[PDB]
């Protein structure tokens, strides 16, 4: 039997770890940028550091449904970027938290110590997000958020405009929900490892 | 590259939003 990258147990494990990291990061961004009120969040521990978890069931289910779709894309190494876009009441983008991801074309079948230094890496990103409010101006009241995903274009590109994954429909975002005229770029953290390279930065409206 | 792709379902508000299928 011939195996593809996604068939590797290691690929599935890393995808699970990274998908959960994105969930923790999204919750934290929503908290520190006050997209949702502080009242719905509760302090919890992840990667041995304090994090903030929404206790609103609807929002939690939405975030899980969204990110569950990214999991298979991660296993196949087709994800290039996952972005959390914060928009004002005028539907204009005010901040964008960009998570760039690269993974090797394969992972070892000798899964021995696959996740040995991964936690320290994820922890560093969470800590940077935790204090990001110190380098950003407060957002206007009434903001909302959208999650954007960029993948690598394969051979037989799918031309379908409404692509469904795990019973969740996705569509192409419009220029309005993304375009920012020469925004301020703020690097947060860039790290590498044998199983992943990730770069997080924020784009802030001028 | 392909994207940016976004969920067709918008993020939920604290209390449910209005009826507007299109």
UniProtKB/Swiss-Prot annotation, chain A:
Residues 12-202 form the HORMA domain. It is found in: Nucleus; Cytoplasm, Cytoskeleton, Spindle; Cytoplasm; Chromosome. Keywords: Cell cycle, Cell division, Chromosome, Cytoplasm, Cytoskeleton, DNA damage, DNA repair, Mitosis, Nucleus, Transcription, Transcription regulation. Residues 20-154 are annotated as: Mediates interaction with REV1 and REV3L and homodimerization. PROSITE patterns: HORMA. GO terms for cellular component: anaphase-promoting complex; chromatin; cytoplasm; nucleoplasm; site of double-strand break; spindle; zeta DNA polymerase complex. Pfam families: HORMA. This is Mitotic spindle assembly checkpoint protein MAD2B. It comes from Mus musculus. The lineage of its organism: Eukaryota, Metazoa, Chordata, Craniata, Vertebrata.
UniProtKB/Swiss-Prot annotation, chain B:
It is found in: Nucleus; Chromosome; Chromosome, Centromere, Kinetochore; Cytoplasm, Cytoskeleton, Spindle. Residues 7-22 have a biased composition (Pro residues). Transmembrane segments: none annotated. Phosphorylated by CDK1. Mitotic phosphorylation is required for the attachment of spindle microtubules to the kinetochore. The modification Phosphoserine is found at residue 15. Interacts with MAD2L2. Interacts with POGZ, CBX1, CBX3 and CBX5. Required for proper alignment of chromosomes at metaphase and their accurate segregation during mitosis. Involved in the maintenance of spindle microtubules attachment to the kinetochore during sister chromatid biorientation. May recruit CENPE and CENPF to the kinetochore. This is Chromosome alignment-maintaining phosphoprotein 1. It comes from Homo sapiens (Human). The lineage of its organism: Eukaryota, Metazoa, Chordata, Craniata, Vertebrata. The gene is CHAMP1. The chain holds residues 330 to 351 of 812 of the full protein.
């Amino acid at each position: 039997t011939t195996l593809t990258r996604q068939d590797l147990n290691s690929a599935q494990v890393v995808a699970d770890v990274l998908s959960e990291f994105l969930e923790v990061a999204v919750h934290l961004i929503l908290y520190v940028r006050e997209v949702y009120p502080v009242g719905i969040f509760q302090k919890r521990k992840k990667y041995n550091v304090p994090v903030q978890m929404s206790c609103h069931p609807e929002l939690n289910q939405y975030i899980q449904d969204t990110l569950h779709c990214v999991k298979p894309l991660l296993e196949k190494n087709d994800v290039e970027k996952v972005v959390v876009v914060i928009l004002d009441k005028e539907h204009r983008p005010v901040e964008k938290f960009v998570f760039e991801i690269t993974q090797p074309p394969l992972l070892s079948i000798n899964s021995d110590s696959l996740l040995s230094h991964v936690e320290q890496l994820l922890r560093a990103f969470i800590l940077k997000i935790s204090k990001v409010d110190k380098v950003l101006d407060h957002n206007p009241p009434g903001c909302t958020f959208t999650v954007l995903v960029h993948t690598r274009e394969a051979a037989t590109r799918n031309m379908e405009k409404i692509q469904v994954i795990k019973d969740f429909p996705w569509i192409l975002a419009d220029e309005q929900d993304v375009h920012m005229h020469d925004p301020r770029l703020i690097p947060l953290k860039t790290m590498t490892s044998d199983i992943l390279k990730m770069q997080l930065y924020v784009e802030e409206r001028a | 590259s392909s994207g940016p792709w976004k969920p067709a379902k918008p993020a939920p508000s604290v209390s449910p939003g209005p009826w507007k299928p299109i």
